[PDB]
Amino acid sequence: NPLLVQDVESYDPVLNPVLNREVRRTGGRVLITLGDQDIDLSPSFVIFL
Amino acid sequence: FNRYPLIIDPSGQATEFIMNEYKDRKITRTSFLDDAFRKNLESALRFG
């Protein structure tokens, strides 16, 4: 789902893998490691700051 | 099946049949003896 995040001056570093697209592809699934858990990254995701 | 099937294939034909049938779904072969069984199982639970 598209996301819009305000108050970027309080940027949360947890977004670093998302912004850097540090995705790992395995078994047809695009896993992103958000903190300590893996999430199947949907290709339709987008984030605005 | 309702309960998950236990295949008895001394000839080894059923295992390769199963590999062929579910190849399109990225079926993975493992073993209980392998130490890789835990993470393979966990990945299967998360992502089909």
Coordinates of N, CA and C in Angstrom, one line a residue:
Chain A
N1 N 0.8 -1.2 0.0 CA 0.0 0.0 0.0 C 0.9 1.2 0.0
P2 N 0.5 2.2 -0.8 CA 1.3 3.5 -0.8 C 1.2 4.1 0.6
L3 N 2.3 4.7 1.0 CA 2.4 5.3 2.3 C 3.0 6.7 2.2
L4 N 2.5 7.6 3.0 CA 3.0 9.0 3.2 C 3.4 9.3 4.6
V5 N 4.6 9.7 4.9 CA 5.1 9.9 6.2 C 5.6 11.3 6.4
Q6 N 5.0 12.0 7.4 CA 5.4 13.3 7.7 C 6.4 13.4 8.8
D7 N 6.9 14.6 9.1 CA 7.9 14.9 10.1 C 9.1 14.0 9.9
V8 N 9.7 14.2 8.7 CA 10.9 13.4 8.4 C 12.1 13.8 9.1
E9 N 12.1 15.0 9.8 CA 13.2 15.4 10.6 C 13.4 14.5 11.8
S10 N 12.4 13.7 12.1 CA 12.5 12.6 13.1 C 12.7 11.3 12.5
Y11 N 13.5 11.2 11.4 CA 13.6 10.0 10.6 C 13.9 8.8 11.4
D12 N 13.2 7.7 11.2 CA 13.5 6.5 11.9 C 14.4 5.6 11.1
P13 N 15.6 5.3 11.6 CA 16.6 4.5 10.8 C 16.1 3.1 10.3
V14 N 15.0 2.7 10.9 CA 14.4 1.4 10.5 C 14.1 1.3 9.0
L15 N 13.9 2.5 8.4 CA 13.6 2.6 7.0 C 14.8 2.4 6.1
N16 N 16.0 2.3 6.7 CA 17.2 2.2 5.8 C 17.2 1.0 4.9
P17 N 16.8 -0.2 5.3 CA 16.7 -1.3 4.3 C 15.7 -1.0 3.2
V18 N 14.6 -0.4 3.6 CA 13.5 -0.1 2.6 C 14.0 0.9 1.6
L19 N 14.6 2.0 2.1 CA 15.1 3.0 1.2 C 16.3 2.5 0.3
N20 N 17.1 1.7 0.9 CA 18.2 1.1 0.1 C 17.8 -0.1 -0.7
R21 N 16.6 -0.5 -0.6 CA 16.1 -1.7 -1.4 C 17.0 -2.9 -1.2
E22 N 17.4 -3.1 0.1 CA 18.2 -4.3 0.4 C 17.4 -5.5 0.5
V23 N 16.8 -5.8 -0.6 CA 15.9 -7.0 -0.8 C 16.6 -8.2 -1.1
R24 N 16.1 -9.4 -0.7 CA 16.7 -10.7 -1.0 C 15.6 -11.5 -1.6
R25 N 15.9 -12.0 -2.8 CA 14.9 -12.8 -3.6 C 15.2 -14.3 -3.4
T26 N 14.2 -15.0 -3.0 CA 14.3 -16.5 -2.7 C 12.9 -17.1 -3.0
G27 N 12.9 -18.2 -3.8 CA 11.7 -18.9 -4.0 C 10.6 -18.0 -4.6
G28 N 10.9 -17.0 -5.4 CA 10.0 -16.1 -6.0 C 9.5 -15.1 -5.1
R29 N 10.0 -15.0 -3.8 CA 9.5 -14.0 -2.9 C 10.7 -13.0 -2.6
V30 N 10.3 -11.8 -2.5 CA 11.2 -10.7 -2.2 C 11.1 -10.3 -0.8
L31 N 12.0 -10.8 0.0 CA 12.1 -10.6 1.5 C 12.8 -9.4 1.8
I32 N 12.3 -8.5 2.7 CA 12.9 -7.4 3.2 C 13.0 -7.6 4.7
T33 N 14.2 -7.3 5.3 CA 14.4 -7.6 6.8 C 14.1 -6.3 7.5
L34 N 12.9 -6.1 8.0 CA 12.5 -4.9 8.7 C 12.8 -5.1 10.2
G35 N 13.9 -4.5 10.7 CA 14.4 -4.8 12.0 C 14.9 -6.2 12.1
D36 N 14.2 -7.1 12.8 CA 14.6 -8.4 12.9 C 13.7 -9.5 12.3
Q37 N 12.6 -9.0 11.6 CA 11.7 -10.0 11.0 C 11.6 -9.7 9.5
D38 N 11.4 -10.8 8.8 CA 11.3 -10.8 7.3 C 9.9 -10.6 6.8
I39 N 9.7 -9.7 5.8 CA 8.4 -9.4 5.3 C 8.5 -9.6 3.7
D40 N 7.5 -10.3 3.2 CA 7.4 -10.4 1.7 C 7.1 -9.0 1.2
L41 N 8.0 -8.4 0.5 CA 7.9 -7.0 0.0 C 7.0 -7.1 -1.3
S42 N 5.8 -6.5 -1.2 CA 4.9 -6.5 -2.4 C 5.5 -5.4 -3.4
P43 N 5.5 -5.8 -4.7 CA 6.1 -4.9 -5.7 C 5.3 -3.6 -5.8
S44 N 4.1 -3.5 -5.3 CA 3.3 -2.3 -5.4 C 3.5 -1.3 -4.3
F45 N 4.4 -1.6 -3.4 CA 4.7 -0.7 -2.2 C 5.4 0.5 -2.7
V46 N 5.1 1.7 -2.1 CA 5.8 2.9 -2.4 C 5.7 3.8 -1.1
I47 N 6.7 4.6 -0.9 CA 6.7 5.5 0.3 C 7.1 6.9 -0.1
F48 N 6.5 7.9 0.4 CA 6.8 9.3 0.3 C 7.1 9.9 1.6
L49 N 8.1 10.8 1.7 CA 8.5 11.5 2.9 C 8.2 12.9 2.7
Chain B
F1 N -6.1 -35.6 0.2 CA -5.8 -35.9 1.6 C -6.3 -34.8 2.5
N2 N -6.7 -35.3 3.7 CA -7.0 -34.3 4.9 C -5.8 -34.2 5.8
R3 N -5.3 -35.3 6.3 CA -4.0 -35.4 7.0 C -2.9 -35.4 6.0
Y4 N -1.7 -34.8 6.3 CA -0.6 -34.7 5.4 C -0.1 -36.1 5.1
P5 N 0.1 -36.4 3.8 CA 0.4 -37.8 3.4 C 1.8 -38.2 3.7
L6 N 1.9 -39.5 4.1 CA 3.2 -40.1 4.3 C 3.4 -41.1 3.1
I7 N 4.4 -40.9 2.3 CA 4.6 -41.7 1.1 C 5.6 -42.8 1.4
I8 N 5.2 -44.0 0.9 CA 6.1 -45.2 1.1 C 6.5 -45.6 -0.3
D9 N 7.7 -45.2 -0.8 CA 8.2 -45.4 -2.1 C 9.5 -46.0 -2.2
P10 N 9.6 -47.3 -2.0 CA 10.9 -48.0 -2.1 C 11.5 -47.9 -3.5
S11 N 10.7 -47.8 -4.5 CA 11.2 -47.6 -5.9 C 11.7 -46.2 -6.2
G12 N 11.3 -45.2 -5.4 CA 11.8 -43.9 -5.6 C 11.0 -43.1 -6.7
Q13 N 10.0 -43.7 -7.2 CA 9.2 -43.1 -8.3 C 8.3 -42.0 -7.8
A14 N 7.7 -42.3 -6.6 CA 6.7 -41.3 -6.0 C 7.4 -40.0 -5.7
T15 N 8.6 -40.1 -5.2 CA 9.3 -38.8 -4.8 C 9.5 -37.9 -6.0
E16 N 10.0 -38.5 -7.1 CA 10.2 -37.7 -8.3 C 8.9 -37.3 -9.0
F17 N 7.9 -38.1 -8.8 CA 6.5 -37.7 -9.3 C 6.1 -36.4 -8.5
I18 N 6.3 -36.4 -7.2 CA 5.9 -35.3 -6.3 C 6.8 -34.1 -6.7
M19 N 8.1 -34.3 -6.9 CA 8.9 -33.1 -7.3 C 8.4 -32.5 -8.6
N20 N 8.0 -33.4 -9.6 CA 7.5 -32.9 -10.9 C 6.2 -32.1 -10.7
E21 N 5.3 -32.7 -9.9 CA 3.9 -32.2 -9.8 C 3.9 -30.8 -9.1
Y22 N 4.8 -30.6 -8.1 CA 4.8 -29.3 -7.4 C 6.0 -28.5 -7.7
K23 N 6.7 -28.8 -8.9 CA 7.8 -28.0 -9.3 C 7.4 -26.5 -9.5
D24 N 6.3 -26.3 -10.1 CA 5.8 -25.0 -10.4 C 5.6 -24.2 -9.2
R25 N 5.4 -24.8 -8.0 CA 5.2 -24.1 -6.7 C 6.5 -24.0 -5.9
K26 N 7.6 -24.3 -6.6 CA 8.9 -24.3 -5.9 C 9.0 -25.2 -4.7
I27 N 8.7 -26.5 -5.0 CA 8.8 -27.5 -3.9 C 10.2 -27.8 -3.5
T28 N 10.4 -28.0 -2.2 CA 11.8 -28.2 -1.7 C 11.9 -29.5 -1.1
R29 N 12.9 -30.3 -1.4 CA 13.2 -31.6 -0.8 C 14.2 -31.4 0.4
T30 N 13.8 -31.9 1.5 CA 14.7 -31.9 2.7 C 14.7 -33.3 3.4
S31 N 15.3 -33.4 4.6 CA 15.3 -34.6 5.3 C 15.3 -34.2 6.8
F32 N 14.7 -35.1 7.6 CA 14.7 -34.9 9.1 C 16.1 -34.9 9.6
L33 N 17.0 -35.7 9.1 CA 18.4 -35.8 9.6 C 19.1 -34.5 9.4
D34 N 18.8 -33.8 8.3 CA 19.6 -32.5 8.0 C 19.3 -31.5 9.0
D35 N 20.3 -30.7 9.4 CA 20.2 -29.6 10.3 C 19.5 -28.4 9.6
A36 N 19.3 -28.5 8.3 CA 18.6 -27.4 7.6 C 17.1 -27.6 7.7
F37 N 16.6 -28.6 8.3 CA 15.1 -28.8 8.4 C 14.4 -27.7 9.1
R38 N 15.0 -27.2 10.2 CA 14.3 -26.1 10.9 C 14.0 -24.9 10.1
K39 N 15.0 -24.3 9.5 CA 14.8 -23.1 8.7 C 13.9 -23.3 7.5
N40 N 14.1 -24.5 6.8 CA 13.2 -24.8 5.7 C 11.8 -24.9 6.1
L41 N 11.5 -25.6 7.3 CA 10.2 -25.7 7.8 C 9.6 -24.3 8.1
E42 N 10.4 -23.4 8.8 CA 9.9 -22.1 9.1 C 9.6 -21.3 7.9
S43 N 10.5 -21.3 6.9 CA 10.2 -20.6 5.7 C 9.0 -21.1 5.0
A44 N 8.8 -22.5 5.0 CA 7.5 -23.0 4.4 C 6.3 -22.5 5.1
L45 N 6.4 -22.5 6.5 CA 5.2 -21.9 7.2 C 4.9 -20.5 6.9
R46 N 6.0 -19.7 6.8 CA 5.8 -18.2 6.5 C 5.2 -18.1 5.0
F47 N 5.9 -18.7 4.0 CA 5.7 -18.3 2.7 C 5.2 -19.5 1.8
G48 N 4.3 -20.3 2.3 CA 3.8 -21.4 1.4 C 4.8 -22.4 1.2

